[PDB]
Design a binder for this molecule. Structure first.
Ligand SMILES: [Zn+2]
Ligand SMILES: [Zn+2]
Lengths: 21, 56
Protein backbone atom coordinates (compact mmCIF):
# COMPACT_ATOMS: atom_id res chain seq x y z
CA UNK A 1 0.00 0.00 0.00
CA UNK A 2 0.97 3.66 -0.45
CA UNK A 3 2.22 4.65 3.01
CA UNK A 4 3.78 8.11 2.96
CA UNK A 5 5.74 9.86 5.72
CA UNK A 6 3.85 13.10 6.33
CA UNK A 7 4.49 15.64 9.10
CA UNK A 8 1.49 17.88 9.76
CA UNK A 9 1.05 20.28 12.68
CA UNK A 10 -0.82 19.95 15.98
CA UNK A 11 -3.45 22.67 16.41
CA UNK A 12 -6.39 21.62 14.26
CA UNK A 13 -7.56 21.30 10.68
CA UNK A 14 -11.11 21.19 9.34
CA UNK A 15 -14.49 20.57 10.97
CA UNK A 16 -17.13 19.87 8.26
CA UNK A 17 -19.61 17.81 10.28
CA UNK A 18 -20.24 17.59 14.03
CA UNK A 19 -19.23 14.98 16.61
CA UNK A 20 -19.53 11.33 15.59
CA UNK A 21 -21.78 9.02 17.62
CA UNK B 1 -4.67 16.27 -4.21
CA UNK B 2 -1.98 13.67 -3.59
CA UNK B 3 -1.28 11.00 -0.97
CA UNK B 4 -4.73 11.31 0.65
CA UNK B 5 -5.28 14.11 3.19
CA UNK B 6 -1.79 13.27 4.49
CA UNK B 7 -3.15 12.75 8.01
CA UNK B 8 -3.83 9.79 10.30
CA UNK B 9 -7.58 9.16 10.52
CA UNK B 10 -6.97 8.34 14.20
CA UNK B 11 -4.58 11.13 15.31
CA UNK B 12 -5.34 13.90 12.83
CA UNK B 13 -1.58 14.48 12.90
CA UNK B 14 1.29 13.30 10.71
CA UNK B 15 3.98 10.63 10.69
CA UNK B 16 4.20 7.52 8.52
CA UNK B 17 0.67 6.72 7.42
CA UNK B 18 -0.87 4.32 4.91
CA UNK B 19 -3.19 5.79 2.30
CA UNK B 20 -6.49 4.02 1.67
CA UNK B 21 -7.58 3.17 -1.88
CA UNK B 22 -11.22 3.31 -0.86
CA UNK B 23 -10.99 6.80 0.62
CA UNK B 24 -8.64 9.80 1.21
CA UNK B 25 -7.55 8.50 4.63
CA UNK B 26 -4.15 7.51 6.01
CA UNK B 27 -3.29 5.37 9.09
CA UNK B 28 -0.33 4.92 11.45
CA UNK B 29 -0.32 1.18 10.71
CA UNK B 30 -0.87 0.19 14.32
CA UNK B 31 -3.43 3.00 14.52
CA UNK B 32 -5.66 0.71 12.50
CA UNK B 33 -8.23 -1.53 14.17
CA UNK B 34 -6.04 -4.39 12.89
CA UNK B 35 -2.34 -3.44 12.76
CA UNK B 36 -0.43 -3.84 9.55
CA UNK B 37 3.10 -4.19 10.98
CA UNK B 38 4.12 -4.88 7.41
CA UNK B 39 2.35 -2.75 4.84
CA UNK B 40 -0.13 -4.55 2.50
CA UNK B 41 0.88 -6.05 -0.84
CA UNK B 42 -0.15 -3.56 -3.50
CA UNK B 43 -3.51 -1.94 -2.79
CA UNK B 44 -5.26 -1.61 0.58
CA UNK B 45 -8.45 -0.39 2.22
CA UNK B 46 -9.15 0.96 5.69
CA UNK B 47 -11.41 -0.77 8.23
CA UNK B 48 -14.49 1.02 6.84
CA UNK B 49 -13.86 0.45 3.13
CA UNK B 50 -12.92 -3.02 4.31
CA UNK B 51 -16.29 -3.60 5.93
CA UNK B 52 -17.66 -3.17 2.42
CA UNK B 53 -16.16 -6.65 1.91
CA UNK B 54 -13.78 -5.70 -0.90
CA UNK B 55 -10.18 -5.55 0.38
CA UNK B 56 -7.27 -4.32 -1.75
ZN1 LIG C 1 -2.29 7.70 14.36
ZN1 LIG D 1 -10.99 3.82 3.38
Amino acid sequence: ARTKQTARKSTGGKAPRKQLC
Amino acid sequence: GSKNEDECAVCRDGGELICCDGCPRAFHLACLSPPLREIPSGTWRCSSCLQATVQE
